[PDB]
Amino acid sequence: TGVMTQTPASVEAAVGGTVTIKCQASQNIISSLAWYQQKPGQRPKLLIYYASTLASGVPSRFKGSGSGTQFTLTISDLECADAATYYCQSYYYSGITYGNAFGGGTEVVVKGDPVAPTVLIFPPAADQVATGTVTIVCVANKYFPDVTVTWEVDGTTQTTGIENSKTPQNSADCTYNLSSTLTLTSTQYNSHKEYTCKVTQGTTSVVQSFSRKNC
Amino acid sequence: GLVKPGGTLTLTCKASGFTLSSYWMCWVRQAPGKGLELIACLYTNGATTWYASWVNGRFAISRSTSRNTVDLNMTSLTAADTATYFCARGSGSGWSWFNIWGPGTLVTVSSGQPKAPSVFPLAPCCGDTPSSTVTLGCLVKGYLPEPVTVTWNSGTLTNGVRTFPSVRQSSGLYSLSSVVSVTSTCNVAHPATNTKVDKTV
Amino acid sequence: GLVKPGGTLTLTCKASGFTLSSYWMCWVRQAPGKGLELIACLYTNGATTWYASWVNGRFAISRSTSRNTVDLNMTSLTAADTATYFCARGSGSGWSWFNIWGPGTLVTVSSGQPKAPSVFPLAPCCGDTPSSTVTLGCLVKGYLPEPVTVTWNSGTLTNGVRTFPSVRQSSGLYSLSSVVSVTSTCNVAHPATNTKVDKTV
Amino acid sequence: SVMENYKTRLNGILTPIKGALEIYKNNTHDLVGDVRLAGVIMAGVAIGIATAAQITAGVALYEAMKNADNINKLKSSIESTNEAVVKLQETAEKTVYVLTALQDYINTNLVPTIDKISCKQTELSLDLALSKYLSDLLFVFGPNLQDPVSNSMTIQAISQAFGGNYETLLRTLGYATEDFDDLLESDSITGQIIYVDLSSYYIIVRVYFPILTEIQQAYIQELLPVSFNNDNSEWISIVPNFILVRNTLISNIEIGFCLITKRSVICNQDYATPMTNNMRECLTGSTEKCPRELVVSSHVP
Amino acid sequence: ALQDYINTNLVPTIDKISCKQTELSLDLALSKYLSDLLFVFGPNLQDPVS
Ligand SMILES: *[C@@H]1O[C@H](CO)[C@@H](O)[C@H](O)[C@H]1NC(C)=O
Ligand SMILES: *[C@@H]1O[C@H](CO)[C@@H](O)[C@H](O)[C@H]1NC(C)=O
Ligand SMILES: *[C@@H]1O[C@H](CO)[C@@H](O)[C@H](O)[C@H]1NC(C)=O
Ligand SMILES: *[C@@H]1O[C@H](CO)[C@@H](O)[C@H](O)[C@H]1NC(C)=O
């Protein structure tokens, strides 16, 4: 059958640098390869067809090369907006030989200017206390690089009840956003007096607190 | 989007920018957070079909040839079949790269039935001191069908919109959060359960 | 470069940027201070050859077809045959303009035998007043093979390098001069006699 | 969908040839060689009815099967070829040459103009090219080809699969001889289909390139007819214009199937035919035995 | 012969295809011309004085 060995799975490169993605076909495909761009929560965007031809309206810094079994994709003068997952696909059709497959994909992430996070915390509503389940969310805004998230009630660390999802890199400054939420029942929410949420960016660390009454 | 393990589902192309019969047409699938996977193409004649090696007659393409639609049929579904199913037109009559991608249809296999979303107004309390910069938003949890739409006061101010991606809890339902910032106002709709509630401005 | 009147010489192409058999290949010659003259081409098949009207079987092309080389053979040489012999690739398989020129091989017919160059350190004496601008250099004379290479302290400072062209004396040997300028250091090599002397910095 | 339709049509054309070849391939067995038998055995009961030439052609097909299997090891490479003429090397053993139909048209007339004309225009042009190729190829490889197990088909007819460019086919294999044109025009250079691939839609042909041999003690005398007058009338002797003499034996000859040159008569077989004794006696010198015919035409030698 | 093919099909596409591709196409054109011309001007033409 037909398979596509795409390397590497993920890669890091600073803004203004060059990144190289490679796709390997099990069989000869005679320059019948395409390259797509896909950003999270979006449909793919065509970049290169026939291994070399650039799709209309695509910047020239995306350069494809290769023939037969080995192909490469090179992105020069890297920008923040370039961070996305990049796929390759074979549409080989001699007439008698059929070779169609997608690449595994390569996640590219561009190193922007380091930026400290601004930490926020949120209190539960009154209807939230009902049914005995309460979510308190702690969010971090405009930050890079990746940060660790920790919660601490009354001087104690918690391993369960937390779920966090991170937005895609902002296309202008390569900054991530976080939304960590913690859930427990209303009886244990009322028994503890105060909760604190700690965000850590290397040596730097940001904390946020809130009273039990009111916020 | 709702479907039962072992059930069947039928999807349709939503490209609608051309005559569907004159173009090369595949169905591309992408599991959440996974790579794109090609399922099945359909030649312009309408009888010859291409299938990946793994489908093995589990999926089937046809076209309405009158309403200008293309369908995909599914059987014996499993948890691995949960994905976004993309209808991709392919630039030409024959085999080729895709330059038009359909919006896609979310598909969720699960023993659970559609659950109405729980909307919470999260907000810094009135007791704390109000700064010049304020941050507000809504919270949506307790819903089983993946697709959510988060608009804000009918979307007249979207400069500070910051919607977050969904996440599963251990029980199988999702939850998201959205925050805004304005100088010192929220409607969330969930079509599968047909809930469009908006209160506490 | 050394050869005796009536002797024979064999040259080789130094292009080495492609497969030699797939391209149109001539040998171009240029007497010192004279115009370019075309000697002989060689078709890609390797048997058919083109010759100018004046050679009349005096020159001959062949290819090693294994080491990817092309040769030129010469007989009954005279003083007119003294020239730089260029191997020129010609853009295509068939007849065409040349877009790649080989570096060329100097050829000198002469009754004399290779003579080692005489290197002199010319320099304004230490007695005269030293100005802010100083001009230094070397001098090479007394050598019979035309090609000279003039480098300077292994070439780490080439901003003020000013090498001059060679000239013949009446007896048949050459002489050149090179000058530099720096703020208040010379190696000349002559490969045919295999002399690479460098002293008096 | 043009290529799928073309594949279906070409399979419909090619399947009978493959079955006809398989009739002999399946019923030809190569027993373990030894001193008792020096060849392969043909299943006469399984063949059923066959002429001598057809059985000899089956033997030739067997002898081809070895190099045919060697060539088919490169099947994946054959499918990947995108040039009109290509040379295949793997171990410098039996270098395989591959000719592809319409590949030059795809490379020089459709791919270069793909930018200039619409996709539907290009598709229609491709379909037209394939259909014309089928219309021209059908005369030779259609139902007219009844016995594919035969090395009697000329290479010019065989080359219709390659647009009739038999010069490229012959020069690619490297054939070279003074009698190249004499062998070609006398229908002496022949080919035989030795393998048909219905999945990859390619065939392997074996070119039989002979050498002309002068038949010793034999010549062919020609007579130039001229009208002669008798009884106030014009007449023409009704006599063989070409007489074959071999070992001083007079016989007729079927010149029509031979190539006549100024120096010799070139034939792809012995075309001698018997002559009645009266004609031989007249050529012997009994002129009253040769008939004549009235000349009424205004133009006669 | 073949001058119209040289002028309208090979020189216009010389930019678009490789030199080896163009050379092969030219050789193919000449060989097809020889294959078709041979039936009339080959050894079949025994008496050119006619
Ligand atoms: C899909 O398959 C099922 C079972 O084979 C069948 O009931 C259903 O009608 C099919 N749908 C389409 C659109 O073919
Ligand atoms: C050049 O010609 C001379 C004399 O004919 C001969 O000795 C020599 O081998 C030739 N060289 C080459 C490279 O053919
Ligand atoms: C020849 O044998 C092959 C393999 O056994 C079989 O597929 C084919 O149908 C046979 N053909 C005939 C004419 O018996
Ligand atoms: C196919 O296209 C590629 C890229 O345009 C090109 O490099 C190659 O030479 C082409 N091959 C043929 C046979 O036209």
Residue numbers in the entry:
A (entry chain L): 1 to 95, 95A, 95B, 95C, 95D, 96 to 211
B (entry chain H), C (entry chain H): 10 to 52, 52A, 53 to 82, 82A, 82B, 82C, 83 to 100, 100A, ...
D (entry chain F): 74 to 374
E (entry chain F): 174 to 223
Paper quotes:
The enveloped surface of HNVs displays 2 viral glycoproteins, a receptor binding protein (G) and fusion glycoprotein (F), which mediate receptor attachment and membrane fusion, respectively.
mAb66 is a monoclonal antibody (mAb) that neutralizes NiV through recognition of NiV-F and was derived by DNA immunization of rabbits with expression plasmids encoding NiV-M, codon optimized NiV-F and NiV-G, and soluble NiV-G derived from the reference Malaysia strain. mAb66 neutralizes NiV-F/G mediated viral entry and fusion with an IC50 of <1 μg/mL. Structural analysis revealed a crystallographic asymmetric unit containing a single NiV-F protomer bound to 1 Fab66. Fab66 recognizes an epitope within DIII of NiV-F, with residues included within the range of Lys60–Lys80 forming the majority of the binding site.
